């Protein structure tokens, strides 16, 4: 795995010693090269995970996420070039280093074999994210958003730390392989119930769950474009990955303890999508759509059926790409109009046609237009829930309807109607912005061709 980790580390000295005119260029080049190298990990075995060493391993769950992170870094740099263009060289290098550190941490999280190592790194991801949000945010709510995000995540994580150490003391090892081979069923004792809660709540906080999702709107809206990209593309999937890993030692208590969270998420998807319907901020709308799409994954993980897990992995990858793209488009519009009010800018389709096409394709992916991987994951989760209970189809179909409604509503309000007259600073789309949108869309549509790669280890 060091074939990916070591170059990622070597990015930092390069960025620090790169010329002020070559910082972005060098970073983008070598980040793309690192993504190319990470592509090799997709060759997962049929049964055994790719155990590179005692500390790092990968499976058909970890590899897509690793590729996603290594691919997301260059696009984040490209997006960050615009607003961080009047910054001093040292601070620009600092931002690049924060992004690189975040990518390195995420790689190690997705490859860590030891559960406590995963906890350490997955909670280490907070520091770069917090710094990015609080320092390079544009509004005054950035400080409160960072506080909310950090405190939510820590309040979830600390009981998880206690529980993990308890497991290490009792079982003797926290290695995923040993934990899976030496799995022992949990009883219904209150101690086991609280252990299950401690092991689940942290990941429930990580991937916004209705009731504990209050941090996400603030974080996504206040954070800079790159920060929002990671927040909505990988940092949320951290919760899903950790939950799928930790559910191995949380059975059969999951059957009894899932009902609260299952109902919370099944109603939360509807609630959040309805909230999207009546939103005035573009980034807030995108964030709430993310909340709903992640609630789908939460349901899938809780049900613990093989189809559910496959759909969960596919949905995670698809949502990462789509949400990052949506935030990038909103960022371009925001940079041009210097406001996040959705109704402020209207009829942008006339002024910017190609960006409007990008908007259309992104919204289509958001509403899970067949045969996009978004639809593949959503349909798999829907079928798994239908097997769990036939009544689920009601809420699932209603959520699909509301998602389509609010996505098309966003497209109509922004990229349709009479153009706003006073807004005269809408210049033609830059090549960089179009390239960013293309590098978000094309991989997803290509992934639809060979979904087996992103269908998880249960394929």
């Amino acid at each position: 795995m060091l074939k990916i980790i070591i170059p990622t580390t070597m990015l930092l000295p390069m960025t620090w010693m790169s010329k002020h005119n070559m910082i972005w260029i060098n970073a983008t080049v070598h980040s793309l090269l690192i993504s190319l190298i990470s592509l090799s990990l997709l060759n997962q075995l049929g049964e055994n995970s790719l155990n590179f060493s005692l500390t790092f391993f990968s499976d058909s769950l970890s590899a897509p996420l690793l590729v996603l992170t290594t691919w997301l870094l260059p696009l984040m740099l490209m997006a960050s070039q615009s607003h961080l263009s009047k910054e001093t060289t040292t601070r620009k290098k600092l931002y690049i280093t924060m992004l690189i550190l975040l990518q390195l941490f995420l790689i190690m999280t997705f490859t860590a074999t030891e559960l406590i190592l995963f906890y350490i790194l997955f909670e280490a991801t907070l520091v770069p994210t917090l710094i990015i949000i609080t320092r390079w945010g544009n509004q005054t709510e950035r400080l409160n958003a960072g506080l909310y995000f950090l405190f939510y995540t820590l309040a979830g994580s600390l009981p998880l730390l206690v529980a993990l150490v308890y497991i290490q003391n009792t079982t003797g090892s926290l290695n995923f392989l040993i934990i899976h081979y030496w799995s022992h069923p949990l009883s219904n004792s209150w101690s086991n119930i609280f252990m299950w809660l401690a092991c689940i709540m942290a990941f429930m906080v990580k991937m916004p769950l209705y009731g504990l999702h209050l941090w996400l709107p603030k974080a996504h809206v206040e954070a800079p474009i790159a920060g929002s990209m990671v927040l909505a593309a990988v940092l949320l999937k951290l919760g899903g990955y950790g939950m799928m890993r930790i559910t191995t030692i949380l059975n059969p208590l999951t059957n009894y303890m899932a009902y609260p969270f299952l109902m919370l998420s099944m109603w939360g998807m509807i609630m959040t999508s309805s909230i999207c319907l009546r939103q005035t901020d573009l980034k807030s709308l995108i964030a709430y759509s993310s909340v709903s799409h992640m609630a789908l994954v939460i349901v899938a993980i809780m049900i613990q059926t093989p189809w559910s897990f496959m759909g969960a992995t596919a949905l995670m990858i698809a949502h990462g790409l789509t949400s990052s793209m949506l935030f990038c488009l909103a960022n371009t519009n925001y940079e041009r109009v210097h406001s996040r009010t959705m109704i402020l800018a209207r009829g942008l389709q006339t002024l910017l046609p190609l960006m409007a096409t990008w908007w259309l394709m992104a919204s289509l992916t958001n509403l899970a237009l067949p045969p996009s991987i978004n639809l593949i994951g959503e349909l798999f989760i829907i079928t798994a829930s239908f097997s769990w209970s036939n009544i689920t189809i009601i809420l699932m179909g209603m959520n699909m309807m509301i998602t389509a409604l609010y996505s098309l509503y966003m497209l109509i309000t922004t990229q349709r109607g009479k153009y706003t007259h006073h807004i005269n600073n809408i210049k033609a789309s830059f090549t960089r912005e179009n390239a960013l949108m293309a590098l978000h869309i094309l991989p997803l549509l290509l992934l639809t061709l060979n979904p087996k790669m992103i269908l998880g280890p249960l394929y």
Partner: protein, 49 residues
Amino acid sequence: ELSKVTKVKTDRPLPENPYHSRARPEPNPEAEGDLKPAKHGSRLFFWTM
């Protein structure tokens, strides 16, 4: 001269246990054979060495 420590050739037997002390407890096992490297090093969570 009266302050000089003198020898006394008594016939009374020397008390075997003048303090009437109880049997002293057995000492703990003392040391062992040689030192060898830790089986897998510092088996502290994720550390392999």
